[PDB]
């Protein structure tokens, strides 16, 4: 059982798919979407070419 669940969705270039991670740096990690270092959760990505 959890308390609340948040879902965020968008489209990411394949060259920086691994920028989405706690304590991670990159071109868009520091500029478009920042994750907390103690982030608890799951990330899901599938191709939509």
């Amino acid at each position: 059982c959890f308390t609340n669940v948040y879902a965020d969705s968008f489209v990411i270039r394949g060259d920086e798919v691994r920028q989405i991670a706690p304590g991670q740096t990159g071109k868009i990690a520091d500029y478009n979407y920042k994750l907390p270092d103690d982030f608890t959760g799951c990330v899901i990505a599938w191709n939509s070419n």
């Binding site: 304590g23 991670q24 270092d37």
Partner: protein
């Protein structure tokens, strides 16, 4: 040894490990010093009695 250089010359998310190692070493050394002081104080108390 300088934790300021660790913080500046190296990224935040991974510097936690180095800071933790420094913390453990310094804390253990402090504990050792305190234990030796306790034993010496006991001996001095016997002499004073």
């Amino acid at each position: 040894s300088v934790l300021n250089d660790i913080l500046s010359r190296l990224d935040p998310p991974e510097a936690e490990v180095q800071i933790d190692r420094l913390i453990t070493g310094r804390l253990q050394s402090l504990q050792t010093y305190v234990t030796q002081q306790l034993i010496r104080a006991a001996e001095i108390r016997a002499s004073a009695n």
